[PDB]
Each structure stands twice: as C-alpha cells, then as structure tokens.
Amino acid sequence: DIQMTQSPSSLSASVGDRVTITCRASQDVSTAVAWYQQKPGKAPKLLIYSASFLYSGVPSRFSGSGSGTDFTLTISSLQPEDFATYYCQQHYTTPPTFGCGTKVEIEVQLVESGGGLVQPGGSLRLSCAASGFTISDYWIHWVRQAPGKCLEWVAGITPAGGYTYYADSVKGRFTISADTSKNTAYLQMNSLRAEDTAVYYCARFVFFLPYAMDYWGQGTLVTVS
C-alpha cells in the first residue's frame, strides 16, 4: 500500500493569500496524482488530475505540480469559497488509501441511500445508484469518514464485477456488490461495530483518463449505537 502525507494538516489564511499544500507519497507514483476539495458536510470533488491538470469547471487559481514522490497544490489567490479540506491521493496503484488531508480555513451522478441507526452485531445495506453511465464499466469504491475523523477506503469492486477488495478493518464482515439491472452498487455490512459509524461515500474510478475518482455520491450516515 502507498501512503500519502500532507503538510500542513491545517491552516488559516486570508482572502487574497497564496496557499500551498505539499504532499508526499511513500513510493514513486509518477504523475498519477489527483487533488480533491471537500466542503464540510460534503463529498470530495475532483480539482486536479494527473498532477497538473485542471478538472473541468475548476477555477484557474487552483494549480498542481510534482512527480515521483513530491507533489504540491497551490491556490494562487485564496477566495472565501475556498475553505474546505484538501486531499492529495495517488492513483498509480490500487487500492487508494486516504488520509487526513489539509483543512483550509479563511448528467452523471451517484446517489447513496440506506444509511441509518443500527446496533452492534446488527447489519445494514447501503446503496450507490448510478445515473447517466453504466456502473459496471467502472470500479466502484466505498470510502468512509468517522465523525471528526479522516477518510478511510473500505472496499472496491472492479468493472464487470471481476474482483472485489476490502480494507482489513471490514474484511470478512462487509460485502461489496452490484445489481446491473438496477445500475446500482451495494455495501452489505454485517456484524456492525461502533467503529463502523461514519458517513459512507461511493465513487467511481478507472485507469482511463482522468484516472481520478471523478464522481462521488453525496454520502449516507451510518450510526452504530
């Protein structure tokens, strides 16, 4: 597994400041790095792909650079709407392994559902419905965020359902799947633990361009109490 670390882990600046956030990968990842922006209470959105490429719709004050192990995100002139947590993530190998990102202070979709309250030992099933594309053409990943905690990759299924992958923390307890007639992916969660409490996101990925998690669902909250 390749680890990403950022610095700093948070910062406050003023409107108009130049902000740079650096990122390091534990191994050479070439230029296969993406940056994401995550508003509070929102799913991450793709800003930059392939290290220096602006995802469409992203303002040109955002720029990226680097290759090998060292990467940086620069916001040339910080705007009021730029406050968010920013994540550097390598997509050179799979599975992705997210961390804490950098907290900055001043059609196609996935829709999730099925979140709720359940008790330890219980079980629950999340849904990741797709629109405007065929779900089996992509990897689908489930990534979660505990309250006041960081991003954690949970599970992935390959296109055509060829293979599945699980984080050690859920292996043997969760199943990732899909139903193609419903164009919808699932995470079936058994033997739930309090640790499992979090907002769950799903997102699509392939190694084709831009080879970044370009679409995420809005997230669904799972409370284990």
Residue numbers in the entry: 12 to 117, 135 to 253
Paper text:
To this end, we first exhaustively identified the interface CDR (complementarity determining region) sequence preferences in an antibody-VEGF (vascular endothelial growth factor) interaction system with experiments based on phage-displayed recombinant antibody libraries, and then used a structural informatics-based system to rationalize the CDR sequence preferences at atomic resolution with computational molecular modeling. The rationalization led to insights for a machine learning methodology, aiming at designing interface CDR sequences against designated epitopes on antigens of known structure.
Antibody has become the most prominent class of protein therapeutics and diagnostics. Experimental platforms based on phage display of synthetic antibody libraries provide rich information on antibody-antigen interactions. In this work, the aim is to use the data generated from phage-displayed antibody libraries to develop and calibrate computational tools for rational design of antibodies.
